[PDB]
From a paper:
Another clinically important and often antifungal-resistant Candida species, C. glabrata, contains a glycine at this location, suggesting that this protein would not form the intermolecular interaction. To test this prediction, we determined the structures of C. glabrata [name] in its apo and FK506-bound states. Examination of the packing revealed a close contact between the 80s loop of one subunit and an adjacent molecule in the apo crystals. However, here the 80s loop is not inserted into the active site of the neighboring molecule. Hence, as predicted, the C. glabrata [name] structure shows no evidence of an intermolecular self-catalysis-like binding event. Strikingly, the C. albicans and A. fumigatus [name] apo structures all revealed the deep insertion of a proline located in the 80s loop into the ligand-binding pocket of a neighboring [name] subunit. This interaction was not observed in the C. glabrata structure, which does not have the corresponding proline residue.
The 12-kDa FK506-binding protein ([name]) is a ubiquitously expressed peptidyl-prolyl isomerase with considerable homology between fungal pathogens and is thus a prime candidate for future targeting efforts to generate a panfungal strategy. [name] proteins all catalyze the cis/trans isomerization of peptide bonds N terminal to proline residues in polypeptide chains. In addition to its role as a [name], [name] is a member of the immunophilin family and is the target of the immunosuppressive drugs FK506 and rapamycin. Three extended loops, which have been called the 40s loop (between β2 and β3), the 50s loop (between β3′ and α1), and the 80s loop (between β4 and β5), surround a deep active-site pocket that binds both FK506 and rapamycin.
Author numbering: 0 to 114
């Protein structure tokens, strides 16, 4: 149960452990189940509610910076909270009506798989 502050002011809180050995590296495909929330409790996205996970390549700019920085510090199976500041998330614009300008996003993510 580390808490870790990393590039971007991104905070990783470890909720439940992974294998402690299998971590994603740049380029790796990662399969994630997540839930995204605003600082005010408002939920804004959830792969769990959709019944199917999210896949992406990591550290190639295909997801928010906070995930490129954050996901690779998790081990397979690990469940963690990422607290990602605006610049590492949707930025100074956000998506108006959904995500406020420069909003801090809280993600509860579980790394399910690395390839």
């Amino acid at each position: 149960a580390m808490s870790e502050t990393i590039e971007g002011g991104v905070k990783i809180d470890r909720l439940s452990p992974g294998d402690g050995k299998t971590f994603p590296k740049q380029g790796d495909l990662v399969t994630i189940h997540y839930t995204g929330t605003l600082e005010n409790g408002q939920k804004f996205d959830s792969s769990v509610d959709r019944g199917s996970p999210f896949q992406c390549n990591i550290g190639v700019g295909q997801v928010i910076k906070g995930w490129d920085a954050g996901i690779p510090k998790l081990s397979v199976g690990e469940k963690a909270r990422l607290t990602i500041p605006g610049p590492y998330a949707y930025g100074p614009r956000g998506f108006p009506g959904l995500i406020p300008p420069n909003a801090t996003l809280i993600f509860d993510v579980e790394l399910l798989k690395v390839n």
